[PDB]
Structure 1
Amino acid sequence: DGVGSSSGNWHCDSQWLGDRVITTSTRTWALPTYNNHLYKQISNSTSGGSSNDNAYFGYSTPWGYFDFNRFHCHFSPRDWQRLINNNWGFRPKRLNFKLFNIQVKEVTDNNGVKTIANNLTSTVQVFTDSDYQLPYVLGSAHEGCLPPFPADVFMIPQYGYLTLNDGSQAVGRSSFYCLEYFPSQMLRTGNNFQFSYEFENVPFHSSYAHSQSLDRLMNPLIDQYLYYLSKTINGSGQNQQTLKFSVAGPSNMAVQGRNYIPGPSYRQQRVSTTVTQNNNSEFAWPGASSWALNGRNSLMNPGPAMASHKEGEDRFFPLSGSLIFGKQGTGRDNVDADKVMITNEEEIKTTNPVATESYGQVATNHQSAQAQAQTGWVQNQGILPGMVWQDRDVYLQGPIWAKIPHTDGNFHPSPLMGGFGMKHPPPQILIKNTPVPADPPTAFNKDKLNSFITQYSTGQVSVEIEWELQKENSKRWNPEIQYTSNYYKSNNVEFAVNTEGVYSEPRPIGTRYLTRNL
């Protein structure tokens, strides 16, 4: 429109209908100039990397991008509490995104002092990768998302991508992408940008915990009509071999026939938070479970959805089997256990195997009069018919969605870090300040200009997402477990600001508090 007219209003609210909840969040953003308007080839050689497992090749772009792939970007703690305490499931339906109130500033430095002024004629470029023609980086748990607290002003992260690499070198199959080779809208201070997105059909997330275990689905009062081999010898010596059979009933539930079995496994090492119970050696990387791709080892992290620990074993965790969040103010490198928040998936112990245990035991020979029957620990077990399992729970500060890789085949493409897997997720939204050259020389020079006016941009961003709800219809008589704040007095209110205005999330919040039968 014009310089003196706002191009949008501040929309931040949650609307709770019967089967739907609409979340709207608005944030103020700041966008600097990245790479001084240049594309730069990057690799482990440029960053000084040495290990083969961490070698990479890619490019850093002068473009930024908007990321809102975390639940706290849309749900307040109270809204999250309502969702998790009142619904058996939820899923995103549609998306509305807006950029408005664009403000481009120029910075001039004379001598140790910088002056900031408006540049009303400068432009900012925005476009969406609706055709998914660029590498998708929103599927990784990267920082730079919209802040959970609406009053926080955030910096737009720089967009970068990786391609095929051989050490620090590239190959002929490696791809280079120029983001200026895409049509993009150019916005001055009076212009705004908006688009709508429809989520593809995804299953409802399981925001419930099973009230039954897979091995306890039988009637505890009635025998089965099936038999089991109870004895093989002749009880109370030589030549004592005689078959025996008994009815599988309530007294021996472990041997009853069952139609379904727990889901797959890939065993993790077990770590205690009581440090003196751990071995006196360096076992992080060495002791960890991993997978290999083209000679590179990548940590199995977080891996298959598996129960974090056995009942009562709360002190133990799988070495890389769980999402680890950092508390407010936590450092980047080598922080103590009290500075991080270790999530756990104990709710899925009713259907999923324990991460630090074998799947089970399997026969490994043919027993005879000369050879005793032998069994072997199944340390990893693939998908088998009749298996059932629960996916990893999602969290308030955890990811929402991920892009399913474009491959010939996949199985249960639920993101392993939690969330909704989609072939066509919300498109990447890329933003960049248009370069403004400084005064050029009065004589023609064919070289590209390298002198630009120092600029940055700021504005507001709004994203509205409609969520579909799956209401609970339980006939359970006793009250359910519910997420609740603790009344006991404390220096600060949980999920609030401190005396210095710092917002903090004191604990990870899952979604599985209500219960339903298996």
Structure 2
Amino acid sequence: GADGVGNASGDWHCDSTWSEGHVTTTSTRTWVLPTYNNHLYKRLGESLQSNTYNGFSTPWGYFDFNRFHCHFSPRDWQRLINNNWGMRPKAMRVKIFNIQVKEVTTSNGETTVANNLTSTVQIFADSSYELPYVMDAGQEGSLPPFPNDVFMVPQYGYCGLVTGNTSQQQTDRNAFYCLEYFPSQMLRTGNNFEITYSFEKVPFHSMYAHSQSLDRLMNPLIDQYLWGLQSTTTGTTLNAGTATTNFTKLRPTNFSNFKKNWLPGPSIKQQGFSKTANQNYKIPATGSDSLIKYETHSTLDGRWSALTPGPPMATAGPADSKFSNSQLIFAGPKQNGNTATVPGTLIFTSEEELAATNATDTDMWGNLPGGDQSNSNLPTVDRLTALGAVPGMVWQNRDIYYQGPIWAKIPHTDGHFHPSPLIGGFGLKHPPPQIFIKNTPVPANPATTFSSTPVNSFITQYSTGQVSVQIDWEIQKERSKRWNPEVQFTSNYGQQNSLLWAPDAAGKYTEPRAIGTRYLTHHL
């Protein structure tokens, strides 16, 4: 990739091509790149007991396309989800171009901008995965959903290890990575970048809700050939009757005692809250009794971490007054602030579909006897609040969302367990590589006599250009023998003043709701 100054170095492609069981999304967006940290690396750190962290902020920016709406349009996502029991990324190709480097000159009063033709910009992809991976933390920076929205490239920054739960102080293990210590490609207008990636083979995402329920997978018309204890006494009253060993053949209408082959999957109880302000308990944000303490969390090296997405568990409804972590929440259309007090201002996700295989988040997994029953003792009935893997469990994973993550890098650790990103998406060992970009520094007028001191005065600059990502998605059509019509993502937003999923009168594009994927159905 290399030509002249007055020659576009690439074209605008915003395809959409469906077929058999392959769909290829292609999209381009214009971007802007500032001069981060005024050209330098800055060591980050701040002791915040549990929020304690340390690291570094770099002068580099980076492209992030880890959000579904970066590739599919509303209509597409609809297509995709109303006719396919699953999908998955297969291949990706990214390309940056039409680089334009600008140098600003703030006048006596206001700023004036001009084209620095010979100025260069750098790009390079960490395809060896030797740098903290940031594109999968569910953070901002991905491309805009709306094709014609210009966006700012995010600043690259990474965290180191926090030794302790007190100080951000760093050990001899903490490491510093320098992006200049990498081979980068230098570009000027007329040059361009391009790269290709191939997704690892990964399981198709569900994209369907279950019909049958795990506890009702038998023939309602027939007896088991298995027997069990029905009751130890004769009455209808606890601890009172002639006392006997009553065994049953386990036949229809019973079912809750039918011997079964599979159990619901692992769960960890979550605290449930109400959207109606006065049904909660009045826990504060800050303080020694901050919400954190009362919400189910994990503990790493003395530090707390909300069990946020957490294990795949059946959740509350999107409409239900109850909600909780485990439920993804996105900003509403009219919500533009770091804070809100009106539930109706936000968007609530829901894993209600999982109630066919997984346990409910706020409830429990089941119950255990708290001791050994006797003729002179009925044991306490304990609560199975958290339960790990056990032979015979099966479960569904969290759904995927139109404005959700697409993939996440699996942690470089010997051993794990069922690698599905908890925020959702595809867990890859080596995922789409992070592409870094940064404007090259331009020394301003220099001293006329030598100085071993590093340069300070730099011309002020910023760049802009387009970028396009093309991902090949493998999808699988359904083919069920279900007779009755299925549920489907439909418009149904009724009459409206300014069409939904479209810019308003002021020219602002905003996403009305969150869209799932599990509309279609498959049995167990």
2:75 aligned counterpart, secondary structure:
helix
In the alignment, what sits opposite 2:254? Answer: 252
> Match for 1:177: what amino acid?
Y
**Per-residue CA shift, 1:362-418, capped at 9, x if unaligned?**
122111122113321011010111111111001000000000000010110000000
1:241 aligned counterpart, secondary structure:
coil
**Per-residue CA shift, 1:416-454, capped at 9, x if unaligned?**
000000110000000000001001101000000010000
Deviates more, 1:54-63 or 1:273-282: 273-282
Matched, 1:197 2:197: yes
Which of 344, 355, 367 lines up with 1:349 in the alignment? 355
What are the residue-to-residue correspondences of 1:219-368 with 2, within 5 Å?
Answer: 219-235=219-235, 240-282=242-284, 284-309=291-316, 314-318=320-324, 320-328=325-333, 329-368=335-374
1:245 aligned counterpart, secondary structure:
strand
Q: State the alpha-carbon separation in 2 of the partners of residues 274 and 39 from structure 1.
A: 46
**Per-residue CA shift, 1:303-344, capped at 9, x if unaligned?**
00111128x9822112x2111101234211344312211101
Deviates more, 1:170-179 or 1:358-367: 358-367
Return the TM-score normalized by structure 1. Answer: 0.96
**Per-residue CA shift, 1:176-214, capped at 9, x if unaligned?**
000000001001001010010000000000000001110
Superposed displacement of residue 138, structure 1 = 0.8
**Per-residue CA shift, 1:254-299, capped at 9, x if unaligned?**
1101100111111011112233333355473232110000010011
In the alignment, what sits opposite 2:287? Answer: none
Superposed displacement of residue 216, structure 1 = 0.9
Q: State the alpha-carbon separation in 2 of the partners of residues 281 and 402 from structure 1.
A: 33
Matched, 1:218 2:223: no
Q: State the alpha-carbon separation in 1 of the partners of residues 376 and 44 from structure 2.
A: 64
What are the residue-to-residue correspondences of 1:101-500 with 2, within 5 Å?
Answer: 101-166=98-163, 167-235=167-235, 240-282=242-284, 284-309=291-316, 314-318=320-324, 320-328=325-333, 329-486=335-492, 488-500=494-506
Q: 1:342 to 1:284 in 2, by over 3 A?
A: farther
Q: State the alpha-carbon separation in 2 of the partners of residues 81 and 277 from structure 1.
A: 37
Q: State the alpha-carbon separation in 2 of the partners of residues 306 and 393 from structure 1.
A: 11
Q: State the alpha-carbon separation in 2 of the partners of residues 332 and 42 from structure 1.
A: 22
> Match for 2:118: what amino acid?
T
Superposed displacement of residue 128, structure 1 = 0.2
Gaps of 5+ in 1: 45-49
Q: State the alpha-carbon separation in 2 of the partners of residues 438 and 471 from structure 1.
A: 60
> Match for 1:203: what amino acid?
P
Superposed displacement of residue 486, structure 1 = 1.2
> Match for 1:55: what amino acid?
T
> Match for 1:194: what amino acid?
E
> Match for 2:330: what amino acid?
F
**Per-residue CA shift, 1:454-484, capped at 9, x if unaligned?**
0000000000000001110110110000000
Which of 42, 45, 52 lines up with 1:43 in the alignment? 45
In the alignment, what sits opposite 1:47? Answer: none
Identity of aligned residues (%): 59
1:169 aligned counterpart, secondary structure:
coil
Q: 1:238 to 1:26 in 2, by over 3 A?
A: closer
Matched, 1:81 2:78: yes
> Match for 1:342: what amino acid?
F
1:291 aligned counterpart, secondary structure:
strand
1:230 aligned counterpart, secondary structure:
strand
2:32 aligned counterpart, secondary structure:
strand
What are the residue-to-residue correspondences of 1:53-92 with 2, within 5 Å?
Answer: 53-92=50-89
Number of residues of Structure 1 aligned to a counterpart in Structure 2: 511
The answer to whether the 8 A contact 2:234-2:240 is kept is no
1:78 aligned counterpart, secondary structure:
helix
1:463 aligned counterpart, secondary structure:
strand
The answer to whether the 8 A contact 1:367-1:374 is kept is no
Q: State the alpha-carbon separation in 2 of the partners of residues 317 and 485 from structure 1.
A: 25
**Per-residue CA shift, 1:232-270, capped at 9, x if unaligned?**
124499894321101212211111011001111110111
Deviates more, 1:224-233 or 1:178-187: 224-233
Q: State the alpha-carbon separation in 2 of the partners of residues 3 and 72 from structure 1.
A: 33
Deviates more, 1:427-436 or 1:483-492: 483-492
The answer to whether the 8 A contact 2:283-2:291 is kept is no
**Per-residue CA shift, 1:467-508, capped at 9, x if unaligned?**
001110110110000000016211121111011111010100
Q: State the alpha-carbon separation in 1 of the partners of residues 105 and 283 from structure 2.
A: 55
1:297 aligned counterpart, secondary structure:
strand
Deviates more, 1:389-398 or 1:229-238: 229-238
Provide the alpha-carbon RMSD of the alignment. 1.6
Q: 1:250 to 1:314 in 2, by over 3 A?
A: farther
Q: State the alpha-carbon separation in 1 of the partners of residues 513 and 65 from structure 2.
A: 20
The answer to whether the 8 A contact 1:330-1:340 is kept is no
Deviates more, 1:230-239 or 1:486-495: 230-239
Q: State the alpha-carbon separation in 1 of the partners of residues 415 and 293 from structure 2.
A: 31
Q: State the alpha-carbon separation in 1 of the partners of residues 491 and 504 from structure 2.
A: 17
Q: State the alpha-carbon separation in 1 of the partners of residues 37 and 282 from structure 2.
A: 45
> Match for 1:232: what amino acid?
T
Q: 1:279 to 1:477 in 2, by over 3 A?
A: same
> Match for 1:165: what amino acid?
V
Q: 1:239 to 1:5 in 2, by over 3 A?
A: closer
Gaps of 5+ in 2: 285-289
1:229 aligned counterpart, secondary structure:
strand
